[PDB]
Amino acid sequence: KVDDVTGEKVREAFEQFLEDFSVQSTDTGEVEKVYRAQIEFMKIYDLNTIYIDYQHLSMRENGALAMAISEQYYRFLPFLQKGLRRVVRKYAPELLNTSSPEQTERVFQISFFNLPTVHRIRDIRSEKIGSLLSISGTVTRTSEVRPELYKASFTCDMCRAIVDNVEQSFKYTEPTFCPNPSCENRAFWTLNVTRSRFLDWQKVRIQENANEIPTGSMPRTLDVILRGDSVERAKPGDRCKFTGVEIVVPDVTQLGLNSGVTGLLGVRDLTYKISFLACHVISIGDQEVFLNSLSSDEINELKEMVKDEHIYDKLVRSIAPAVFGHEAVKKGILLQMLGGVHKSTVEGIKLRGDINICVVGDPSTSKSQFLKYVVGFAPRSVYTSGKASSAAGLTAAVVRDEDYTIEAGALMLADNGICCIDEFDKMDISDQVAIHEAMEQQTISIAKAGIHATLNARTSILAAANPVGGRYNRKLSLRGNLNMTAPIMSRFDLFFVILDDCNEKIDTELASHIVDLHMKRDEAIEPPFSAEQLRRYIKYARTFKPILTKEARSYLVEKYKELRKDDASYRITVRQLESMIRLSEAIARANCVDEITPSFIAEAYDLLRQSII
Amino acid sequence: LRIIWGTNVSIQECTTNFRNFLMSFKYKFRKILDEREEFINNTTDEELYYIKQLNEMRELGTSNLNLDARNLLAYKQTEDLYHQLLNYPQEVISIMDQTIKDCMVSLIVDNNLDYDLDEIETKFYKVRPYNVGSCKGMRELNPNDIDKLINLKGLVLRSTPVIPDMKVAFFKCNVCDHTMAVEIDRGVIQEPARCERIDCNEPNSMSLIHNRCSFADKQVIKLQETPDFVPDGQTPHSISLCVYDELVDSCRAGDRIEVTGTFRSIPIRANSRQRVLKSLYKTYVDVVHVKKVQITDQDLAKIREVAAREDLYSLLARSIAPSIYELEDVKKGILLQLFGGTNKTFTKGGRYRGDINILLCGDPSTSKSQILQYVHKITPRGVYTSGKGSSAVGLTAYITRLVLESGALVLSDGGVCCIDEFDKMSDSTRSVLHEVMEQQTISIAKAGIITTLNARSSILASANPIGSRYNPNLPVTENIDLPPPLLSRFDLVYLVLDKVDEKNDRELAKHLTNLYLEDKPDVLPVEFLTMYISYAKEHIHPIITEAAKTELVRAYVGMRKMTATTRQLESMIRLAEAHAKMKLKNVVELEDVQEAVRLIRSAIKDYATDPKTGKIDMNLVQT
């Protein structure tokens, strides 16, 4: 058999690089043969995959190894695997085997990260196929993990001769001839799952970033193949960078299992489908545990902010730094982001811990800007315009998969986080009633297409709307200014009212703020806290679970009585009391107080009264 | 000698004629074929055009060389070769490609500038003849025209994704691990009957490997027949244009492109597996060249002189519709919209959009849609629509299965949008337009497919009065009948009403009668004004300054005293930046913001409008 001299040289170079990389960046410029030490660590864990920075290869052999890999990854991959196996046999023989039943040779994976260049899906070309490449994009979907027939073992029925670990092409393959010289069998090959070796298989569809597209055109889609550890290494709907060799998928029907190559297939034409194989996958998109996750400097900053007694007012001011005014809306947004403790009665009734609000006001009040800021701040959040949306599609999705299946809904993108709704008045009142149906009970479910599916639907809801007539009418009642279900309005924690102020001082202040913004970009805004610091504070407060005090309960009793007196009917209810409890928990979180306080309940009642207007 | 089959003309002779065109053919020959000796320059003429072009290709480092059939005709032997090309375009194009490569090697050696002959050999020079024939529609193309060179103009209905093309097959023997590469000729791979290695001694052992097989870039672009070429009674027939290598993705879809190419006819298999092919042959055009359908220094100097002129604002307004009468203010607003305001993007507050949208309401015979067609002609990219013909889904996005398709407003994006019968346009379509205009971009959500398409289009709307003739008693906004959200979204609102006097009637009748009196009857040329708007956008990036900010704050507070939308203040800033572009001022000034506020006041006849209820006295309109 012919052997590639360049391939053997690349295998020797890879073995030398692994065994004598001799470059350790840990704690100082040092030599530790970091690749060999990583082989020892993978021996400690019996791991089969190795991660190598591309810069390490670019430094090694003056970048000759990196150049060979980037130029001919497809050609040198078997040679690289052979060199890795040689280094494994030299250092960790247990890693050389799978590692009592006899242990087969362990599969070896080589992962390359931190490639110098990342290309869009549109940037890929047919000439780029067969070479290592890093691709930036968002994973639209991911296939289920499957046992791809990496190695196949067949048995001949005629003479009982058996083949083992036969390599398979894109289509399923069988041995060309019977291993027994006497037997002439070329068929009757029966596979054995145990003797055959199957690697994990997962195809993750990806697409270019919609922001990356200049003209807003549909992003180009690329198929990324995830195998072994790469399977379930990414999530659908999350941006990720994939590194590996671009591949071309032939037509299985043309192989026999637009222009097409022919005359090889034989008479049949063969059309090529471009694809990508990703060697490495990277995602580009308790209070003590959160503190440990935070760095030391981040922990110190969060501790200082929590120690501040004016932390509540400072966070409320920091909300929407570009926006001027709407401090009540800012306080409501901060309380919603902080959230509240969930509680469920012994009878089985379960209250909602997440805060939900609906804002109604005249246009040009930056309610949409508040929604954009909230969507940017809140983790696991999705923003959308109500008018250009599908009511059922937002809550859930159902589609047939190559058989009926269930697709993730838009509300699930907001799960465990805030959900921003723009043009809520423009959105269908049927969609609003659907939200009310899936607000307090949550538990979105599917019953169509013959397949029943369940969705937790746990999220906070924020909305922006234009009141009837195009501007808020103070004479018009708070209920009915934006047509929506009365039980939904009751369950809503607050109903913010926005009215234009004709005061000349306020007009001049808003004009000067807008002009300074347009002149100085972000420098004009002076929030008390940075966005990342406020997010860390929100996470810490969420880790905290405020507890009602006895005096707090007495104060809540008095405040509910005051709200009923204000009703003296539809505006105030036990749902208003529940909103008071949730806002008290959020206020205790914002003030960093461990327990609910009568002052926190007073602030909650004040916010509810502001909603009452 | 080597001769193209069936031509009785040597391929070596064709290459020699192309070589005589590349070298020993003066640019004076092309200039003389063009005649216009006063226009032609003697020094550039004395220099060899194709020699300079090959040297320019060497300087660019690109094998491709644009070709002119007019220059081929200018050289005599090259004209004979171009006729031979018209007979056999593909063969002569390959011959000209080889000739361009050989001439590039000889030119590198002659110029002695550093270059690699091996690099020239690795490069595959491209011949892209143009002006070979008059542009014609796909319906005009004929099977006799197949395999004959032609230049064709067409509007791209859509551009297909890049298609892999088997440049060369590669055979790898599974039995003996042999490696081989087989060139693909006529789109068919060649497979040896026996193993390439004699030592293997295995018949048909070689196996093609697709990844090992060489792939050349290829693409197709659907091309609608040109509107003049299309029959008046039926929509144009469309034929996709084959493209490859540098020609691939040369022009974006939705923009007119002129691609010279040779028409091709291919048998269509009755069944994909079956060898049988239908007697009918599918027809497609393979483009030898791809072309469209930026300011020259002299054009920029002319635009600078115009912008220096104080009369230039009204001059460009009149130039938009030189024959039209009495709508100079609406045309000036349209010219400001064509210039566009500057767009600013910030981390907070989103991105302020500079594009300006203009709404115009005119009583019938306002010539508002004549001016709108004039604005569509003046715009570098023109979109014209009728309100009755407009649809909201068509304006935003469409889905074909399931992939989103560009809306009418999205196709307008990158150019000015023209709307006629805007009062007749559906209020639901206007409601769809409200979000798209406020965001300056379109976002669409639907079952199966949900995606956002860019909608950064300057919008011009010609609207009937709500009454059949504009009523002074009716409020101007009510007469325009635009929904309030869309009116806020629009940067400018225009109101035009006819005023009756004996002398004015004499003037209007005299204008119409003068146009009639001719058997065929300060304004910049329309193309020059489009170039002036392009140069204004390119070399002028107005931003809010201190003087413009004093004017803007004063205008915002005063309009609030008069209610002011914050979007209107941004629209005034965009119109001010548009005015600075109209004046070629690098930054917005107080005069620009004052002119922008004055333009808005004059556009809606706000000065004409009565103080109460927004109604405008008819005499107040037109002063």
Curated annotation (Swiss-Prot), chain A:
Positions occupied by motif Arginine finger: 490-493
Phosphoserine: residues bearing it: S217
Catalytic activity, reaction form: ATP + H2O = ADP + phosphate + H(+)
E.C. number(s) listed in UniProt: 3.6.4.12
Subcellular location per the Swiss-Prot or TrEMBL entry: Nucleus
Class of the enzyme per the UniProt entry, highest EC level: hydrolase
Swiss-Prot/TrEMBL keywords: ATP-binding, Cell cycle, DNA replication, DNA-binding, Helicase, Hydrolase, Nucleotide-binding, Nucleus, Phosphoprotein
Binding site residues for ATP: G361, D362, P363, S364, T365, S366, K367, S368
An example Gene Ontology biological process: DNA replication
GO molecular function (one): single-stranded DNA binding
Source species, domain of life: Eukaryota
Residue positions, PTM Phosphothreonine: T549
Primary location group: nucleus
A GO cellular-component term linked to this record: nuclear replication fork
Other notes: Present with 13400 molecules/cell in log phase SD medium.
Family classification: Belongs to the MCM family.
Complex formation: Component of the MCM2-7 complex. The complex forms a toroidal hexameric ring with the proposed subunit order MCM2-MCM6-MCM4-MCM7-MCM3-MCM5; loaded onto DNA, forms a head-head double hexamer. Interacts with MCM10.
Protein function: Acts as a component of the MCM2-7 complex (MCM complex) which is the putative replicative helicase essential for 'once per cell cycle' DNA replication initiation and elongation in eukaryotic cells. The active ATPase sites in the MCM2-7 ring are formed through the interaction surfaces of two neighboring subunits such that a critical structure of a conserved arginine finger motif is provided in trans relative to the ATP-binding site of the Walker A box of the adjacent subunit. The six ATPase active sites, however, are likely to contribute differentially to the complex helicase activity.
Stated name of the protein: DNA replication licensing factor MCM6
Organism listed in the record: Saccharomyces cerevisiae (strain ATCC 204508 / S288c)
UniProtKB/Swiss-Prot annotation, chain B:
Name this polypeptide is given: DNA replication licensing factor MCM4
Major subcellular location class: nucleus
Keyword Membrane assigned: no
Organism lineage: Eukaryota, Fungi, Dikarya, Ascomycota, Saccharomycotina
Motif Arginine finger, residue numbers: 488-491
Note: Present with 8800 molecules/cell in log phase SD medium.
GO biological process, one term: double-strand break repair via break-induced replication
Function: Acts as a component of the MCM2-7 complex (MCM complex) which is the putative replicative helicase essential for 'once per cell cycle' DNA replication initiation and elongation in eukaryotic cells. The active ATPase sites in the MCM2-7 ring are formed through the interaction surfaces of two neighboring subunits such that a critical structure of a conserved arginine finger motif is provided in trans relative to the ATP-binding site of the Walker A box of the adjacent subunit. The six ATPase active sites, however, are likely to contribute differentially to the complex helicase activity.
Portion of the full sequence shown: 177 to 852 of 933
Broad class of enzyme this protein falls into: hydrolase
Disulfide bonding pattern of the chain: none
Designated gene of the protein: MCM4
GO cellular component, one term: DNA replication preinitiation complex
